[PDB]
Symmetry: C3
Subunit: 418 residues, 3 copies
């Protein structure tokens, strides 16, 4: 277990270049199982989840290689059982199931891992795929899916909003016979990106980014080149880093329209924000943030993947702020870790009530999941003294070179063995 | 999203006439799928859930009409697949499954909605129906049930207490061959009402209201007229309205024996209560309540559907009071909303620790579920200033004309578009 | 509902003799379904769970008798459906399923009860058994398993650590054809004990106590005599009893190597500990404990079954201590009960933050589960005045003669009807 050792307080100031989105790179990598000619995916972050997906892909029979891009040749996929050891390490592995079924008529994928922030069922993926014509059973721990012949498109009303199940159904639909309509579709920018990737390959899709997507199945998808959009959560995290540290930053290679709610909330906190076409600047003008209220919800509302980060901002802000998490039922694990650093929070139900303090103290804390870990490192940067964040591998699932990026803003961080 | 705008403080005083029970009207409406002659159900509240059930019923092929009564002619039911869009909006839709199977040999119902106050599985309904002889599978999101021929009665020990699964098994049993015994049956007054409805139709049932119900199957049920019992929770809510507001009320068209535990607890809080045959009066004699301790449990203990309401009473009472919720695992969502109004609560596990304050403050709050919403409106009536309760549609699931009823007691409420 | 009435404060001092482990006696009793000659199991505690298991065993066709030992003759097992009424009362009943399948080719067991400290799924047991070749379905509430012929050994990587599913797979593997490897196996001392029991009977097992167990199936198991190891949790509870009461104790018939983490934590709390080969002594030298931090995890880390107990120690200790529960998601029910006795705890997520007080007060409290109940009795022993712990039957699931043992240390306890 690597740990980060952080020494504060430090103010965070400067610039950062945003990497491709974790959560777009991932569904695109799996969507490439559909492709029957080679694909190049540009602007792909170097993340643990990306490495594992490439390995998983390779074990199905794909030819895979990366640099700034990931190259995938999926023409000769010939294994339909995903490797369990890889699947259990992340959420995104669930996305092998859909394409394997749609293209090959069968697939077997065990239940995913990922962030331990809820029970995280996959029932809507399974329901969707069944509505498209698949037969599914859970056996030995695998989700085992099949269909004789093609899937058949269907009108599918999603019972609840779900990013991942939207991707599964949209992807599988691209090779079904007929038309699929997804109602109550997730609107996240990563589904738009995924959809636009698919279209590059020859898919017929419209409505992505709205609550309804329409897909007309085609016989085969081709190949192509596609560049992944910037990471909005990595963006938001670095904007929070400057905001809590009374700083200023510019974020380069950004996409500001994927952050409306976040930027507004940062303005509410007292931040001076400007945006251009592909960059965002934040300036606190030396001031401590003001407390804000937040309620998480699906895009384009305030994102659950920025909740932990805003927890911390509210805990060193001026005032009382209320943060309500509606999307996941166990995503306050960062809170007691913050309380070990002197924070004043109280949880009531799905809400953390935060009373901001001027300064935190250094402490031995432990990362529980990707965004909690980032949050605890940011805490360590502004806290007095030394913080040791244990189990920092979590961070590497979602941030390329966080240590380097933060270092470049002024942080004093060390990565340490154990 | 309609909202309520409330202006306080206001004292609540006067009288109210209690409507039929939400939670008896609902299972009776679905039980009427059994009937092979027309039925008249009297004293049926005008509630969102009732409207939806009538529409659902009509889509199966029933002829349905209402005024003070709902009229159902179920003779020509000929669709066995319930409409998903209606089913997802409420709990009660689960009750279409049992009667469809018992009478027609098949039925398909997707998973219900309703109050977001727990995971709310339906496994005991499915287990019960299987014990009666049904074959069940979950596929595309539906619970799909069938049996060749009649169900067969069985001795069924309910693994845990459940209102809804008691109703499902009791209802389905009425057309099975032989005798069914339900052990560990729920005893709620709405199951008694349901049972007595069924008996009006020709069912052979005994033991309702006790922990064991015995049903002897008959070949067919007929028709009839039946009046739904008063709503105990609407009763309790209005009694709490007067209790927290230092008031006095009489509740007309009430059934006081369905409220033993609630009335005792209201006496513990300092209320002067009297009861007659069909009415209940409460007088606080101008005083602020005293804090009480409460533990929810199945009937005839203190009901979970009054828990939110008593949360509020304890938060403006004199003293420290402990409220333990044992029935549902996510039914404290009203708590942080109350804390936004200045309440002093702390949650520990399944318990809210409440330290009563003299006055609340007006605040923008949001309703999460039916009884939380009612509670937040009551809070708004006694709070200083303006409260806006967002997402008030929740209330209309369970209260007919709440705005009008409260207005008649002195409240200053406005319903506002959005 | 029996209750305990406790009068404090009382200091707890003296000696105690530790009984056999609840949680080894239980899996061994069920493992004995494998045996085709008689078995004698020595040092078996007199516990409610043991009584129920013997009755369950007898209803499958075993001949069962006990004194200090339990005698089992399983040669004529001839019923494969476990009695539901017995199964629902405890966790351990799940362990009938594996042996019935491995030896007889079929078995039907409803879902277990036990401690209400989480959802407690059995999916890893079912997945494991399927990997060994079983066919499984859930129907009428039963887990129904079968295989034609023997099971076949498999390489099984356990998706998460699980004590019970490790036992199920290891036990069933003893009669499969070929070799089974369990990776990510639970290492608890009770799995070692179980494994060594099995080996007495002729099983071929190695690796128990490590994260990998290897089993080579044999054709039949025989009989034998085996003595159950001491109860580590009962040990830890009595060590906590003396620690919180500023006392001193010696624990006889103990196994100190099963308690490394606990003993270290007790040293951190200020305890003077000594150990011999089969005994442990603790002396506080008259002092109040110091607060400690704890994080639960699988063996050999700090055990979840001592978490409640250490909650209490931290709440009467000097200082602030943080207790993080990672194993079960609803195991803080003792906390509000402790708060009724004047404790200063706050829960945040999976962590209880404890600020120790000098003295508790007597209160009416209620036991929710086995280890919470023991904890509340210990609280009652050091609290000022009278404590009544309701629903004390929970204690009898895991402690033989707790009342007598504590009495012998100086406690003033009464067991009372209701
Ligand atoms: C790899 C990836 O893209 N991860 C992101 C994705 O996760 P993910 O796709 O897992 O999130 P979902 O939108 O599906 O989850 C939404 C809610 O729906 C539930 N649900 C989801 C699927 C299902 O079949 N059944 C079901 O009940 C979940 O338990 C959760 O409570 O979107 C989340 C919501 O923005 C982000 O936090 C994650 O970082
Ligand atoms: C429409 C209606 O009548 N609603 C009422 C009904 O709901 P409802 O019928 O849903 O409530 P239940 O009594 O069934 O629920 C009791 C507990 O058992 C669980 N459970 C229930 C069914 C099942 O198959 N499996 C299972 O595990 C539930 O998750 C809950 O934790 O009774 C509740 C308990 O008084 C009230 O709060 C609801 O307002
Ligand atoms: C009779 C007995 O021996 N009881 C002990 C046993 O319980 P038990 O065997 O039930 O505990 P487990 O180790 O299996 O449970 C570990 C975690 O894994 C989960 N899980 C377990 C099995 C499964 O199929 N699926 C699954 O998801 C559980 O919900 C829990 O969250 O070990 C626990 C952990 O030390 C102790 O607290 C219990 O006193
Ligand atoms: C929620 C944390 C991560 O983004 P995952 O969804 O597990 O990949
Ligand atoms: C618990 C809230 C409502 O009564 P529902 O059970 O959803 O109809
Ligand atoms: C966790 C409490 C008990 O040891 P059980 O596991 O239910 O036997």
């Amino acid at each position: 277990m690597d740990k980060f050792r952080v020494q504060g307080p430090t103010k965070l100031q400067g610039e950062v270049t945003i990497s491709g989105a974790k959560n777009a790179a991932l569904p695109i990598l799996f969507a490439a199982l559909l492709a029957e000619e080679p694909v190049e995916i540009q602007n792909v972050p170097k993340l643990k989840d990306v490495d594992t997906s490439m390995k998983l892909l390779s074990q199905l029979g794909a030819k895979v290689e990366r640099n700034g891009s990931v190259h995938i040749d999926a023409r000769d996929v010939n294994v339909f059982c995903a490797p369990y050891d890889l699947v259990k390490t992340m959420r995104a592995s669930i996305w092998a199931l859909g394409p394997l079924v749609a293209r090959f008529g069968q697939g077997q994928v065990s239940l995913p891992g990922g962030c331990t922030i809820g029970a995280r069922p996959v029932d809507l993926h399974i329901s969707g795929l069944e509505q498209l014509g698949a037969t599914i059973k859970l056996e030995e721990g695998y989700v085992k899916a099949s269909v004789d012949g093609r899937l058949k498109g269907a009108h599918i009303v999603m019972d609840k909003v779900s990013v991942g199940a939207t991707v599964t159904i949209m992807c599988a639909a691209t090779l079904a016979e007929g038309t699929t309509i997804i109602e109550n579709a997730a609107r996240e920018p990563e589904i738009v990106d995924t959809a636009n990737f698919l279209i590059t390959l020859g898919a017929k899709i419209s409505g992505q980014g709205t609550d309804r997507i329409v897909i007309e199945g085609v016989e085969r998808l081709g190949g192509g080149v596609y560049r992944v959009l910037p990471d909005r959560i990595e963006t938001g995290t670095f904007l929070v880093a400057a905001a809590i540290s009374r700083g200023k930053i510019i974020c380069r290679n950004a996409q500001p329209d994927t952050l409306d709610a976040v930027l507004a909330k940062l303005r509410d906190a007292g931040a001076d924000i400007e945006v251009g076409e592909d960059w965002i600047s934040l300036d606190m003008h030396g001031k401590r943030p003001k407390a804000v209220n937040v309620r998480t919800a699906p895009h384009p509302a305030f994102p659950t993947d920025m909740q932990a980060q805003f927890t911390l901002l509210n805990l060193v802000a001026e005032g009382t702020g209320f943060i309500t998490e509606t999307v996941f039922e166990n995503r306050f694990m960062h809170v007691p870790e913050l309380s070990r650093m002197g924070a004043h929070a109280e949880i009531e139900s799905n809400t953390v009530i935060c009373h901001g303090v001027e300064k935190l103290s250094g402490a031995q804390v432990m990362a529980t999941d990707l965004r909690a870990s980032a949050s605890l490192v940011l805490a360590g940067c502004i806290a007095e003294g030394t913080t040791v964040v244990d189990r920092i591998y979590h961070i590497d699932r979602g941030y390329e070179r966080i240590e380097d990026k933060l270092r470049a803003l002024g942080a004093n961080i060390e990565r340490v063995k154990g």
